[PDB]
Amino acid sequence: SGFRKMAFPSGKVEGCMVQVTCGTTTLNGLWLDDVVYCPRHVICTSEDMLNPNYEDLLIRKSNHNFLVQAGNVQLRVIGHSMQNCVLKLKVDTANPKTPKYKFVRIQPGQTFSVLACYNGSPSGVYQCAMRPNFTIKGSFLNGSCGSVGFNIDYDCVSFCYMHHMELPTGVHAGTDLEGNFYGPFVDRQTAQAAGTDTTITVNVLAWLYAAVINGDRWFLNRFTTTLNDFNLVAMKYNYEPLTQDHVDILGPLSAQTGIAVLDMCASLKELLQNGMNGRTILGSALLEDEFTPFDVVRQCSGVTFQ
Amino acid sequence: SGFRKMAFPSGKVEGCMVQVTCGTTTLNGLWLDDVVYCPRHVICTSEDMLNPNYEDLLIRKSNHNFLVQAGNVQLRVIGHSMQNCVLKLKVDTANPKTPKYKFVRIQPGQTFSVLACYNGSPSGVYQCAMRPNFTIKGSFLNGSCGSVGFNIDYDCVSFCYMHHMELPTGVHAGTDLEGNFYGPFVDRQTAQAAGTDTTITVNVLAWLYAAVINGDRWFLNRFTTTLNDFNLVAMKYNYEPLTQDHVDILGPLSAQTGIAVLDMCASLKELLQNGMNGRTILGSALLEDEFTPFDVVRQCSGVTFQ
Numbered sequence: 001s002g003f004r005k006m007a008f009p010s011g012k013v014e015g016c017m018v019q020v021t022c023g024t025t026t027l028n029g030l031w032l033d034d035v036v037y038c039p040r041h042v043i044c045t046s047e048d049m050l051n052p053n054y055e056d057l058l059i060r061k062s063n064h065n066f067l068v069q070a071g072n073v074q075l076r077v078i079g080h081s082m083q084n085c086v087l088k089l090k091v092d093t094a095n096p097k098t099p100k101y102k103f104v105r106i107q108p109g110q111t112f113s114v115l116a117c118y119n120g121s122p123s124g125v126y127q128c129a130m131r132p133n134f135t136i137k138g139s140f141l142n143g144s145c146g147s148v149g150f151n152i153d154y155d156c157v158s159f160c161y162m163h164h165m166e167l168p169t170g171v172h173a174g175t176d177l178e179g180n181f182y183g184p185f186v187d188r189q190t191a192q193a194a195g196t197d198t199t200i201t202v203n204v205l206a207w208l209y210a211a212v213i214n215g216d217r218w219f220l221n222r223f224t225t226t227l228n229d230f231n232l233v234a235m236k237y238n239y240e241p242l243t244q245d246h247v248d249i250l251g252p253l254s255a256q257t258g259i260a261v262l263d264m265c266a267s268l269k270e271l272l273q274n275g276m277n278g279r280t281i282l283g284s285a286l287l288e289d290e291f292t293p294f295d296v297v298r299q300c301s302g303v304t305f306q
Numbered sequence: 307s308g309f310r311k312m313a314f315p316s317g318k319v320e321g322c323m324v325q326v327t328c329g330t331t332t333l334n335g336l337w338l339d340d341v342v343y344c345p346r347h348v349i350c351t352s353e354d355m356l357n358p359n360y361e362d363l364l365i366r367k368s369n370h371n372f373l374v375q376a377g378n379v380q381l382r383v384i385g386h387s388m389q390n391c392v393l394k395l396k397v398d399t400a401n402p403k404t405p406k407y408k409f410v411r412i413q414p415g416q417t418f419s420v421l422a423c424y425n426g427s428p429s430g431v432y433q434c435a436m437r438p439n440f441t442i443k444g445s446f447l448n449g450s451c452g453s454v455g456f457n458i459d460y461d462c463v464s465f466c467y468m469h470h471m472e473l474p475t476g477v478h479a480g481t482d483l484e485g486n487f488y489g490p491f492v493d494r495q496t497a498q499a500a501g502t503d504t505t506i507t508v509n510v511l512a513w514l515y516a517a518v519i520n521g522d523r524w525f526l527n528r529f530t531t532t533l534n535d536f537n538l539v540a541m542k543y544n545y546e547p548l549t550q551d552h553v554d555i556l557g558p559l560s561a562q563t564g565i566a567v568l569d570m571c572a573s574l575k576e577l578l579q580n581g582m583n584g585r586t587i588l589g590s591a592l593l594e595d596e597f598t599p600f601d602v603v604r605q606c607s608g609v610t611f612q
């Protein structure tokens with residue numbers, strides 16, 4: 001019993017983190033096989049931030065401009081290319097700690113662990129989610145760029161996120177490992193806005209099931225509802241529409257608890273309508289939307305990895 | 307910026323987790339040098355669980371009764387002994403991935419990362435605190451016993467917690483690595499209760515400082531108070547007393563924000579007397595007490611470890 005915001009164990013990712021320095025810019029890189037991936041804005045200067053032609057700046061550069069510390073063993077760069085917003089540094093040493101891995105591009109609503117790093121060294125690990133407006137609510141300081149987000153499926157690390165930038169609401173934006181931003185953002189210090197976020201309804205329902213599995217039942221009711229009538233209330237409260245696809249992912253959790261999905265929808269509806277009136281659910285006084293249905297099953301069945 | 311419950315990177319601990327089986331009991335062990343530490347109730351049967359004399363049971367045992375598996379590698383047990391509520395299994399192979407480590411016993415209100423494990427394999431990592439009633443609010447299922455809690459000290463793992471039991475309430479209880487329970491609990495399935503908990507006042511205050519450092523100031527005020535009159539209010543709302551030592555640990559955060567500790571205390575008092583009135587702080591609608599002052603500084607200055 002118990003339910004926590006739980007990250008994947010970070011060991012397999014820690015053994016890939018390196019430091020990349022070019023000019024007076026230091027950030028993090030990801031070293032897989034003989035390749036080091038990092039944000040291309042490592043090749044900028046502090047005045048270049050306003051409107052760089054990264055294509056300008058890369059041909060400017062020679063392999064020897066790139067300093068690639070793995071620990072205090074310095075890695076010789078022997079080639080470089082740019083893929084969208086990531087820079088790929090070919091080095092003369094394959095990473096012996098390379099895990100088995102994939103590059104995946106995730107969908108809004110999905111979650112992943114972030115291993116926050118500075119100067120190639122890990123600082124901490126936390127979950128978060130790709131928000132519907134394609135930002136993430138992370139914890140990043142100067143120097144964190146190149147930190148990555150990932151999921152583990154038994155032995156395989158699926159990398160989904162590399163950090164690039166903080167927007168002026170304190171939320172963060174970045175790319176997949178092929179260098180394409182999530183959302184409309186660009187690696188440029190000109191005014192950009194996140195866009196209004198919304199709540200991940202299917203995740204909120206999964207968390208309500210986590211609650212029931214762990215003994216919070218004070219929010220349930222006999223009420224039932226239809227997908228469409230529930231969806232009328234979702235609009236009103238800035239909640240993502242629920243699809244039949246979503247209902248179907250929630251089946252397993254529905255069956256384990258014996259609570260129909262639309263009955264849980266009726267519970268959520270009364271929760272938005274009436275608020276919580278002092279009570280908490282799983283230690284929270286807000287409805288939590290950063291656990292997927294898989295995160296809930298993962299944790300409430302103790303799935304492991306190696 | 308941003309603020310999350312961030313765990314320590316778990317790599318150094320993952321390389322010490324092993325599986326310990328004896329009879330029909332499998333749980334986790336911690337393998338450091340040539341010693342495997344695990345809960346002594348691995349030697350019990352599903353009927354010993356009631357009121358065992360572990361001395362009874364351990365004399366009954368032979369080295370070959372313990373199956374200790376490090377991945378798929380059979381570790382041979384060559385010696386055993388019991389220290390309070392932990393078993394120490396002497397094995398013929400020293401763990402080549404043993405880190406710099408210490409065994410520490412923490413105080414209530416201190417935090418640590420937990421690496422939850424099943425069958426010797428990591429399942430996830432999360433942060434929590436030693437509650438004032440010496441329980442932890444964890445996430446643990448059957449088979450998780452022997453999972454450990456730890457802090458990192460640049461390069462040194464300080465182990466503080468090993469998991470043993472879940473109380474009714476769904477909170478958890480365990481030992482330090484020398485086998486002494488936190489709190490008055492015992493490793494037998496006789497009726498036991500946690501004891502009323504209280505809020506870690508010093509931790510709520512540094513979390514309010516984390517909020518200010520990150521741009522939530524809606525709760526701040528003109529007012530100040532005396533440590534004596536604040537503590538009159540902390541009593542009324544089931545908060546731990548604030549000591550002058552606590553005021554002193556909050557100095558650094560106080561100086562960075564320029565808000566006196568006693569000004570922040572006046573702010574918390576109005577929060578307690580009025581509530582939050584629909585507003586959130588750092589994404590929470592409750593006052594959060596599982597960040598220490600050190601947790602806030604490391605995160606809001608990006609301390610790294612190796």
Ligand SMILES: *[C@H](O)[C@H](C[C@@H]1CCNC1=O)NC(=O)[C@H](CC1CC1)NC(=O)[C@@H](NC(=O)OCc1ccccc1)C1CC1
Binds near residue numbers: 168
């Ligand atoms: C990389 O280490 C770093 C991480 C940032 C720094 C602080 N928190 C983080 O997550 N990223 C950057 O410094 C990038 C570099 C730019 C991408 C090439 N910049 C930013 O994160 C800046 N944000 C920004 O310019 O947003 C656009 C904007 C929005 C409003 C008004 C003007 C511009 C943050 C320093 C501001």
Ligand SMILES: *[C@H](O)[C@H](C[C@@H]1CCNC1=O)NC(=O)[C@H](CC1CC1)NC(=O)[C@@H](NC(=O)OCc1ccccc1)C1CC1
Binds near residue numbers: 474494499
């Ligand atoms: C070890 O893997 C396991 C972990 C537990 C099981 C589920 N959640 C967990 O964290 N620990 C146990 O099974 C231990 C074994 C006891 C230490 C020798 N027991 C418990 O966790 C049980 N709790 C318990 O006996 O508490 C005392 C009590 C309280 C009320 C009434 C009677 C007894 C939980 C299985 C019940």
